[PDB]
From a paper:
Here, a highly sample-efficient methodology to measure serial crystallography data from microcrystals by raster scanning within standard in situ 96-well crystallization plates is described. Structures were determined from very small quantities of microcrystal suspension and the results were compared with those from other sample-delivery methods. We demonstrate that raster-scan serial data collection within crystallization plates can be an easily accessible and rapid method of assessing microcrystallization experiments and determining suitable-quality room-temperature structures.
Author numbering:
A (entry chain B): 56 to 223, 225 to 417
B (entry chain A): 55 to 417
Write the structure that this text describes.
């Protein structure tokens, strides 16, 4: 299975969620606008090959023996695996190439939120590439080759491996986060065209014409205190979210997809504070992935949720909802340790178009 | 999605078909009570029976007393067994405890220092290890997480390593996976169907000198970083010369098919396959079962990439050690570096429902 690379929007936002994630933030090391635009065109050409299951350039072998292969070859024999490659532009990129007056107002800096413990090395970035696929080696291969093609012009600032469900699990079945709770029940679906136009896609009336058809991405590396969470009682765990753990139904209800009655939950339950009704209607497209990088020095599981949210405007999406989570009962068990925002440009229209063409011209 | 039988004369997860994901965890023992540690092995064995069958540990992930923490952490609820295997091993440092000194197998030999070693002592060693292999990473993480939670107060996680993809094959009938250098890895390994080769090279026999290890094996774990910047700027001929096989097909140099037998005299004298081939090491043969890993960036603008090398053998002294010694002149050494190491004695399998991990040692 493959996902079409071209379209009015970039794939990997409203398209079906893939099993694995390789998210990489890049810093730009060149000041030459012409050299960066040339890289964007080379990256788009490589992305077309990668999302179709082909090697980049002239291939991974069969070329001149004296030359290094254009493709590093670790994806040979694998399927496209629904690979999507989604590029975004960080705020720091607009301080380069004379783009200062073209930074959208919707690409706002995030305020400091209570409990933030952000790692500067795992935060920020001039640009990002979100690589989603059902095979993690397909996603890693894409990031590794894009970084190789960009060497000398970009460096990898930080990268994150993520996983969700293993589709080979019934789909429709809501996946569970590493806390044991169903995650994604009340979310914007890719089938909800109208809700995508209202809450996800940027329109030309929003004030930034080059972003029309694109979106804004908020990335948060949220560590979970697994060992602390696992010592809490089942009632404490269900009280934290407002949904039961077995079925995922809201409190007082029977089925997972029963619409919640917020007054029945505790006032600081996560769902009650994150619900659009508690936030002036602010609705988010959550497309995050669980992560487990290993164990820290104290033997604790370095695991959590790599939270990804797409929205029409950061000021009316993540910011008001995250601000409402200031008293979240979940805050006892999580800690945001990394953060980045990106303007995700519109999609590549056809074979002659390229990443970021509406911005650089 | 199916389950792998947990019981047997041997532990599963060695000759078993190699699953997609790996969660390897090394534990240190914090208790001096032998009876308490034996009770943990039985409690771990009961949990493994549930985990490998796709069932939650204990009384379940929910439905119990509201005021009590669930026995199962619950993040594997609604998932298939996903070919989950749990393989336990005992490190040499364990035998300094519980009066097990005289029971250390001679085949559980300390590895000598090899040229180029830069071993991080934090991510090395360990009293014991649990190799969790499954096609679903959430299933693998859930097993390690619940085993450690059951072991709270008696064991602590020393270090862990997650493998996002396999770089090995025990099933030559299936496509050989590729490592992060782009080459097929696992072409000439030991297959799970080759019973005679497994008895000769992998499983410990009673005549080897350690009766309680009969039916088990010996594991060598090596964390190997790859210099992918150095590798990616090397020419295709250089890359193929390093291994002795072409990159596209994986055939030995000069030959057409991956599984054609290597003609060692045609490769360079420092080629990896020529130096590691059993014919170059007095017949020494290994069961490789490693995985790729990438733990983010190196802080220098590059993806961190490596291979978590896992080797099972009948005797460390006659398996990994002579082969690794012969790789002293390996052309691959220019592109890799061993940064973590550990050896473990993998006990025999859990015979039936009454048996438990390590019962031949304790029991
Ligand atoms: C480790 C971090 C987090 C965990 C484990 C978590 C977990 C959950 C769970 C279990 C639900 C209920 C099931 C569902 O509808 O998805 C939920 C709902 C939701 N969460 Fe979170 N969450 C986390 C962080 C966040 C953050 C940082 C935000 C926004 C800033 C957020 C926004 C939402 C929203 C909007 C909903 C939908 C609520 C509704 O409309 O009913 N979550 N989350
Ligand atoms: C990053 C580290 C390594 C890489 C990338 C690597 C790669 C490869 C490749 C491409 C092959 C040829 C295909 C195959 O037969 O599997 C191979 C074969 C082999 N390797 Fe390695 N290897 C690594 C480390 C090691 C180590 C540390 C050992 C032993 C100490 C080892 C022992 C072997 C053996 C025994 C064979 C089979 C040779 C034969 O019988 O023809 N490898 N390896």
């Amino acid at each position: 299975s493959a996902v079409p690379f071209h379209g009015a929007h970039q794939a990997g936002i409203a398209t079906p969620v893939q099993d694995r994630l390789h998210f990489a933030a890049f810093d730009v090391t060149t000041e030459d606008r012409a050299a960066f635009v040339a890289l964007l065109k080379e990256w788009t050409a490589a992305a077309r090959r990668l999302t179709a299951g082909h090697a980049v350039g002239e291939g991974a072998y069969g070329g001149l023996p004296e030359a290094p292969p254009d493709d590093t070859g670790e994806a040979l024999g694998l399927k496209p695996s629904r690979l999507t490659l989604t590029i975004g532009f960080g705020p720091s990129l607009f301080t380069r190439f004379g783009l200062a007056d073209l930074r959208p107002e919707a690409l706002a800096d995030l305020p400091k939120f209570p409990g933030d413990n952000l790692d500067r090395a795992r935060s920020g970035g001039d640009l990002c590439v979100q690589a989603c696929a059902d095979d993690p080696q397909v996603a890693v291969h894409a990031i590794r080759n894009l970084a190789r093609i960009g060497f000398g012009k970009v460096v990898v600032r930080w990268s994150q491996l993520g996983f969700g469900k293993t589709s080979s699990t019934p789909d429709k079945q809501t996946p569970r986060n590493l806390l044991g709770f169903k995650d994604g029940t009340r979310n914007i679906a890719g089938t909800e065209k109208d809700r995508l136009d209202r809450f996800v896609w940027a329109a030309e009336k929003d004030g930034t014409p080059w972003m029309t058809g694109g979106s804004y991405l908020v990335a948060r590396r949220i560590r979970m205190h697994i060992e602390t969470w696992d010592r809490a009682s089942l009632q404490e765990q269900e009280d934290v979210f407002g949904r039961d753990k077995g079925e995922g139904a809201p409190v007082g209800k029977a089925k997972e997809r029963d619409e919640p009655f917020l007054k029945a939950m505790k006032p600081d339950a996560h769902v009650r504070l994150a619900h659009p009704d508690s936030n002036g209607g602010a609705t988010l497209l959550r497309r995050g992935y669980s992560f487990t990088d290993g164990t820290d020095g104290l033997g604790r599981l370095d695991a959590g949720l790599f939270f990804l949210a797409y929205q029409r405007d950061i000021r009316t999406g993540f910011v008001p909802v995250q601000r409402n989570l200031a008293t979240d009962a979940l805050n006892e068990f999580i800690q945001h340790v990394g953060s980045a925002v990106f303007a995700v440009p519109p999609g590549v229209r056809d074979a002659d178009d390229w990443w970021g063409s509406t911005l650089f011209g």
